[PDB]
Amino acid sequence: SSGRIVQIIGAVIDVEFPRDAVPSIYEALKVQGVETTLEVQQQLGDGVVRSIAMGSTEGLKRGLNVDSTGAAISVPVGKATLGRIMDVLGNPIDEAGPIGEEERWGIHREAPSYADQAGGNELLETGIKVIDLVCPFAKGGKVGLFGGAGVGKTVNMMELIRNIAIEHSGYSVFAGVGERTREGNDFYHEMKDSNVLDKVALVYGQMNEPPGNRLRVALTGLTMAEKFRDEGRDVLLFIDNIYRYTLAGTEVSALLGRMPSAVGYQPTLAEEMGVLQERITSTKKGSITSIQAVYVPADDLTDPSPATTFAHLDATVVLSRDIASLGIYPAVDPLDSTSRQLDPLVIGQDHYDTARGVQYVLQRYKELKDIIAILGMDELSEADKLLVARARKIQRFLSQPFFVAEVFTGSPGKYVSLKDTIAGFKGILNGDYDHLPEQAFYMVGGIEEAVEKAKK
């Protein structure tokens, strides 16, 4: 049956229905006359439901009639979604007309059971020196790009999409959650001009949209990826900012009548994150390989949101503002970054020893940096002076110009291989390049080009 809007406060709306006809939790409602949808968050009792609007509330009035749809927000799924741009409710947001849908799935679902979990360890090459060395990825696994504001999350995700998505022969889903509308336009024209668009389903919910949209766009993109996984396919899932799902819950939490927790976050922070993150997984039916960008408020990795996110991922790549502030790119921290695949029984002893060797040299240099700044370089030991020079060179050889960064760097882009990466770092550790100047390793792809840059 139908209900009436009784109260409106920001993005939250209360609707009253007959007591014999209260709509279910997460049920979708439609306002009469006005083009707006509501999602039931709670049943308040006495026939009233609390809901979040999936559109702006400026036109809404008390007393507007509302129709119960009998189900949760249902979006189109399958082959018809490829090469299309869509909103949270699954409507097409491109001028290409109606979607050729044959089936619709509700956005709210249970996670796969403990008995359905996959167990693969197949290594995935990324073409990026630091990542392939200390953060090796695997097919069907979860990757997180942690970092503050302005350190490279989108740029590294675009390089990873170029080096994986294009070459891959399965389907992809790209979800822009709380993203800049300019980045979404550049990426759409980039996928269209690269002829890759026919393999990708694009879902966009940018920063100009209401809290209800930003709170549910991640579930829409994941529902499309789950349809492909359950068909037995291998799928790629990209999420430009998963922090924006948590923030939309913080923005609305207090208006939903929930008391705040530490650092002003919603009390449901760990469960709302677990209900989403446990669905983003590879199963015995099919696989989902996923890369998520994770914003770190004020660069503090101890903030409740970033801190609760680490346990959900297989590979954790950490971007540092102090490295970016020195012109070094990609600005990845080899000491804080890690992966479940960095094991001699998964990769090999030669790779592992090179990675731990690089980490050992950089960890020792971190205590000497403060010594040199007060008492000078000459007071260090003969072994320390040599080690500091290698650490500063290693710190520069981590840098690499990307094809998607040519507009920022000016120089061309370099793809480097796993063996090339290992050989270059072993050479600097063993002392084969002690005679080369420190500036020769800055922005130069493989080890050969560093030997050539020293001559210029």
Partner: protein
């Protein structure tokens, strides 16, 4: 002092009086507190709708509770009282728009406060709107010259970009944005300056400086001073944005400055606490991120198809844009505060101003290591794009090198070459206020540094060398500067032309 004219002006309001009956929805004032009015009976009031009170006072509906309506007054509230009637206008908040606003000072509702007469605009538009979607935009690839070489070379701004100006109190944030507005008087870009929570004498001084530099005729000034209602201070950025969007939607370019988004956030926090909405991270409303993201996503570049559709084919083959320069104030350099954290995460780049560099005499005070532009080389002309490639990251590495090699014994030629060059570019990036440079002037300065001509010049003489070189090229090479200033083009002919002129300059002056 013309008689009869005043009468006919009055007859024009008497002639058009609405003598017919009207059907309206109404309520009664229940309580009046701190700029907040509570009403009973407004059944058809929409969210954000204008409410009409006795004596032409207006309010806005923000809380539509089941049994009451919470409204904020768009002016002075102390004249309102319990029992007064509250009426309903079926219209959303609108402001006047058009070229008639250029060279005028107005309030947050568009009323003139300059006393220069009425604004004969022929078009109004809604203050609250949704920005154009993903498919209607176009990539940023046109420049917005600020006139400062440190900004235009290392942190470029393009038409439709959003660049944050951030630092502490009294270090040149307003000076950077006002000089950027002054430089547009000949660019063909319209300007908007929004003053939020400033004292009226500070606003009057900025307007006097725009007028003395000839930039006022190309600028709209929107004022919401410190004594005005928190509702007007909260709405002013959206009103100014709407006035800038008029040019964007018609295939024209505009620039907007929000002198303090941190003061808009403080005004929004006041209203929200008085409406009894639950507080967040520093007593700030839960939706303080959405306050700024809804404003800043409107500043954009729109495609030819969007302009052609908006103008019903009257304008064709032209893109439109709105560029934004929001300002944010930090406390003792603390960026971890809730509002600064939100805005740095929305803009297409930021310009960090440092008090230690400002006290050390580097007056534009731009920290090259922390400042960055997400559009980069696409927002620069060919000549500046080639002459400035890698300068930002080279200065970032020079600051580190200068600190690391400060107390060590004499180093190799690679270290001395990098250090001696970084010291010269550091002294070159210094500029005076109200003194912008053209593409050719910035180009000569960049060329003399990156091509090695400054290697023989003393650090204490870099400013004198640049000023003399520009003055010499202005007298003896005027036709070359005019060629560089047409589009900022570069080729072997211009490169050799600049080389020959700099060599002759150093060898004879």
């Amino acid at each position: 002092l013309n008689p009869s004219e005043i009468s006919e002006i009055i007859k024009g309001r008497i002639e058009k009086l609405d003598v017919a009956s009207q059907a309206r929805n109404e309520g009664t004032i229940v309580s009046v507190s701190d700029g907040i009015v509570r009403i009973y009976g407004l059944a058809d009031v929409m969210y954000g709708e204008m409410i009409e009170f006795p004596g032409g006072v207006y309010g806005m509906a923000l809380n539509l509770e089941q049994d009451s309506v919470g409204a904020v007054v768009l002016g002075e509230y102390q004249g309102l009282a319990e029992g007064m009637n509250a009426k309903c206008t079926g219209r959303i908040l609108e402001v006047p728009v058009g070229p008639e606003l250029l060279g005028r000072v107005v309030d947050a509702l568009g009323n003139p406060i300059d006393g220069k007469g009425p604004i004969d605009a022929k078009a109004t538009d809604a203050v609250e709107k949704v920005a154009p979607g993903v498919i209607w935009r176009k990539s940023v690839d046109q420049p917005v010259q600020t006139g400062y070489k440190s900004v235009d070379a290392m942190i470029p701004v393009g038409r439709g970009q959003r660049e944050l100006i951030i630092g502490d109190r009294q270090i040149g944030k307003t000076a950077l944005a006002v000089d950027a507005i002054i430089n547009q008087k000949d660019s063909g870009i319209k300007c908007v300056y929004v003053a939020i929570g400033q004292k009226q004498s500070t606003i009057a001084n900025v307007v006097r400086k725009l007028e003395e530099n000839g930039a006022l005729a190309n600028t709209i000034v929107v004022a919401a001073s410190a004594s005005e209602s928190a509702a007007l201070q909260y709405l002013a950025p959206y009103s100014g944005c709407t006035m800038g969007e008029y040019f964007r939607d018609r295939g024209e370019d505009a620039l907007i400055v929000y002198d303090d988004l941190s003061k808009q956030a403080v005004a929004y926090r006041q209203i929200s606490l008085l409406l009894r909405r639950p507080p967040g991270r520093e007593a700030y409303p839960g939706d303080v991120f959405y306050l700024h993201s809804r404003l800043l996503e409107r500043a954009s570049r729109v495609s030819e198809e969007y302009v052609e559709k908006f103008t019903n084919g009257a304008v064709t083959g032209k893109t439109g844009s709105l560029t934004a320069l929001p300002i944010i104030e930090t406390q003792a350099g603390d960026v971890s505060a809730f509002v600064p954290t939100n805005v740095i995460s929305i803009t297409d780049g930021q310009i960090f101003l440092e008090s230690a560099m400002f006290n050390s005499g580097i007056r534009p005070a731009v920290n090259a290591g922390i400042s960055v532009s997400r559009v980069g080389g696409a927002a620069q002309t060919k000549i500046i794009k080639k002459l400035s490639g890698g300068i930002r990251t080279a200065l970032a590495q020079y600051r580190e090198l200068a600190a690391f090699a400060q107390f060590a014994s004499d180093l190799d030629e690679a270290t001395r070459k990098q250090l001696e060059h970084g010291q010269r570019v550091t002294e070159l990036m210094k500029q005076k206020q109200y003194a912008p440079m053209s593409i050719a002037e910035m180009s000569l300065s960049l060329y003399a540094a990156e091509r090695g001509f400054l290697q023989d010049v003393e650090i204490a003489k870099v400013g004198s060398f640049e000023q003399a070189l520009i003055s010499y090229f202005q007298r003896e090479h005027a036709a070359l500067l005019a060629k560089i200033n047409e589009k900022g083009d570069f080729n072997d002919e211009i490169d050799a032309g600049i080389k020959a002129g700099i060599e002759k300059f150093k060898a004879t002056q």
